[model samples]
Target chain A: QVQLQESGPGLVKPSETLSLTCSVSGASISDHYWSWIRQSPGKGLEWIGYVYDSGDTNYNPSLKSRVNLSLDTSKNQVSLSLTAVTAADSAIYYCARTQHGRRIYGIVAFREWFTYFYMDVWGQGTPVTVSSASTKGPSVFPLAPSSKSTSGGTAALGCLVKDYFPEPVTVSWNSGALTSGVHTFPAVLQSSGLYSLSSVVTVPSSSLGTQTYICNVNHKPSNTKVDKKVEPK
Target chain B: TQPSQLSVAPGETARISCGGRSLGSRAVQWYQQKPGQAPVLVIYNNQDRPSGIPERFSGSPDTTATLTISRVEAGDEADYYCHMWDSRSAINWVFGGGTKLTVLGQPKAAPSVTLFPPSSEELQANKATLVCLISDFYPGAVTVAWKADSSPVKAGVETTTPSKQSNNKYAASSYLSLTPEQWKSHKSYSCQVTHEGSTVEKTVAPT
Candidate 1:
């Protein structure tokens, strides 16, 4: 299993780059890709860019001009630098494990596994209010920690995220640092007794887009990770 | 038709089979989405596998071109889905609803775990490493988690992707890196091993 945590300045001034670091453990930072994603109050998930660990990166072309992704192998972490920050950039900044896969579905040899993205494991969000003017954070009332976590030889993690802030926080599961799978229950909550973290992120190799809620699933027992985005209403 | 569930005994091969009549043109891909986890690509097209994947686990693509997960472990129980692509006509991506995998019987045997503490000189350093070895388990699917104390250690763990062998059984290890402060700060740093719905825990105490 992989555990991720995001640490950075809680606020950034406009025109200044917002920097965040994802401290990851339980997994190596090589042979995989990691990303920087942000969630806004009104807007949803905006994938900033990704660092391939090889020093290669694919930034959201929209922000490529001011975005930088880097891998810190020695620390087993990835860093994200977004230049020229603004109020629009305010939200919870996340360091997510990005998955890239290729799905081949055409003819014989002609078809290939088209590469896709999945965000299974995630760092706890570090609020990066673009403007320091923001003093109040997510109004989360302390509550009882419900449910129990059980692990087989291969572990499976399930966490339920309730109404965190004014709006709601979106959840998406991850693996090898990318997003993939089935989002059959993106909008619906589970049967109530069971934790509702399973509605999104059961990546099928052929998915076109990332799903909703970060689901708890079991597949090959990945040192799996998970995170969130916006709900498509 | 695929059965909603397949029950296989521990230490035996559980074949979660998938196929299509006129749609065998393209290759097959297999996904194992465990109980409450995300689906990972174990076998792509036909035969890619890795990491810590127990030897009992593998991709079986033959005349049937199916995914064969051999030597069932309790932890391996989850959902299996197979998909294939057709090239000839308008048939595109094809897949089944999903096949549920259940480990049958309690398990003919149990697993033993051992913790290999850091070396004396190694532990003397500002940073140290601890290793946990789990072997002799029938259902090889086992998970190892570390606890700093009451709080669980969430990261900085790496385990052998595949299990080594002890004559007839399987063995694997998990390594933990910690600062002497974190290691020595608490008297009870434990390694929690979960197998077959049971947990075996060990604490590393320096002499």
Candidate 2:
């Protein structure tokens, strides 16, 4: 009957370690086990293992050697340790509890008992993408000038992520070929976890940049792709 | 992962039920939470049995899927859980609230159990006393109480912290000492644990 919460650094550099903590309330540590689990973008849930109040621990066979789970019984909390993490480890993490042993008595038991499997109770996920960026990124696209003429006009291609986390980002213009006219902006994300920016470029009426323009996010741990395109109307 | 409630008396029958209304199309799975170990599935899709589930743990569907532990024993008081696969949602699996079995009474004959000292063996006073150990309680809330001739013994109990196993089950330990008189009479001493809604008891005499 205890509610659990999680907290940790939202960003880490490649090759460094990733650490997180789960704070438990409403139950005594003496009676239960605490555990960690994670999910990458578009990936299945991965069990990181658990720690007992007595300081005993266990890890998934796949991550046994690399993952460590510890308990702070006095604080009613537990922690997770992931060493030398790459982008593949970047994902939303959660913590949950399992029942020791008992039976369901009535029809209600059938509807209420099936909620304790594999990290059933979860905290809001925090993404810890490994990157060199010191601040979080943008959340929304920047404003652009209205398209008026058919020949040539200034097209503002901006990247706006309302609450983007920190990472290496590239806003570029593509017309079947990589163009050098694209501008790279240095962004420092705010404490509110929101990101926004804009870039403007001139297009020729005779040669409207009728090709795809992409806003690419590049960072440690690996590649994360997001793109946008524009065509003359 | 979460803990489950699944306990049964050695010879008495116990029942485990799973809640599965949120499951759109994914199946429900049942597992056994053994002490200091992981949970092994005993039933899948409500009533279908798995290969390794002990015959003691059976399943049936009346209004919903139910897992029954017949002839429940001390070891039967481990955790039990129900898992439902949700095909309608992006995250497709759900676990049921775990049931904890609390066994009552005396231990029954078990094929896998071995009492440390042979019966009627005499030993020097206080020179390495005899003790009993019971383990692998899933859901982690098992306690061992020593009783002499059906009466509870005072100041002779000790227990271990529940350890987490990779299979996502909890485990613990308990021990007790025997007085010279209690040891000589070869009086019955029992270690009893209450899990879920039943009790499991194990009795031993010093050899």
Candidate 3:
């Protein structure tokens, strides 16, 4: 419903902080939730953190408390600050989703209005490559997959997602109701401060109930996401 | 990268039927997207089932549009996008590369979604995780909204723009930051999903 754009310094030096702001039109930065997401040139994605319209903040523990999410309600913008940056933090950063507006309807009484918000509207990402001219990043990779037989009349549809760095992420799989027959392998720590994760949905070897499946991954270096391409074989 | 790309005449509109082999038009949504930013919405959906929508765009009669940005500043040289929801994947939001002269540049694309149920670690840590996948929504905006007891949730959430996809569009999971008590006992917690407009309030009884 609203249009959003991200503005920030083109570059930041190593060890310095990087700043980016999301300028919103048709929507206010108040009473809504904003997320900062970044993607390294070849890496996955990261969800740096979240900022509520009221200015309250939450971050990914993987950021080591170096990232700060703030708001500029007066300017109709949301901002991000990542301290002690490195080349690994170089990325195309974006500001997304204004999720305070209600859209979800459920028979569930006394529900959560902010419950199902996704970063649908986005800014034309500005590339903040870590360079001598200046500034920072964290990194991540989208979901990639491989399948293997798990010793039954079943297939392990493994949605392997790797390279989620510094900040942690949230991953989900949807297919009508992806509640059962799926297994998520924990995210393994990467020496580069990234994470490698794998999730599996065991399905009948020949009983393909659905044609394709969906796997959505969230990395918070400000809420960056990577969609792993997955389907029933 | 581009939800899709096309060669169209200026002053005219292009329509991309949101698609997944398992997804269809009736179960579609419309999003407003920016190239590198998150998909943000002003209004959306098909009738009321299509949760939040309408604008320089509307979906009720059908994912409709009314371009106001001087078609030329010429719209011919620029790109666009939109979003949607599938009854198939209740929690995941899908995108259409159409709508008001708004959002991301369209590209040829398709998508998949994943919403993982709560796991032991989440329970062990007194937390919960809702996972879903996707990349790309040109002419953008997609939102995954959550609700508990039907009230609004304000904290412990994060969302992002569409990642570039060959045929992609669908957004991530909004972690329902809750205590194990809430996670395990609050079966009524609902993930209200609208990929632009078509919305389906998906409530899962906590496991």
Judging by DockQ against the true structure, name the best candidate: 3
True contacts kept of each: 0.00, 0.00, 0.15
Docking class of 1: incorrect
* Candidate 3 lDDT over residue span B77-153, tens digit each: 32334334433443443233343233333452322334444444445655554444332333335577776667776
DockQ for all models, in order?
0.02, 0.01, 0.07
Across B74-115, the per-residue lDDT of candidate 1 in tens digits comes to 677767766444344332223445578877775345665555
Best candidate according to lDDT = 1
TM-score per candidate for chain A alone: 0.55, 0.53, 0.50
Task: Return the number of clashes found in candidate 3.
Answer: 141
Candidate 2 structure quality by residue, lDDT tens digits, A1-233: 67777766767878788898888788876677666766564344556777777776767766638888887778977788889887787877777664332123336645433222333344544456676666543322322222421213444333332234554344555532555445333332333433323333444433444444445443322234445443333
Ranking by DockQ: 3, 1, 2
**Clash number for each model:** 56, 83, 141
Question: What RMSD does model 2 have?
Answer: 30.4
Ranking by TM-score: 2, 1, 3
Residue-wise C-alpha lDDT for candidate 2, range B1-207, written one tens digit per residue:
333444344587887666655433344566555543334556765566645557777776532566777777665655676665543443333356656665665432211111233112223423223333333345545555668768887764544445533333444444444456656575666767666556677675533
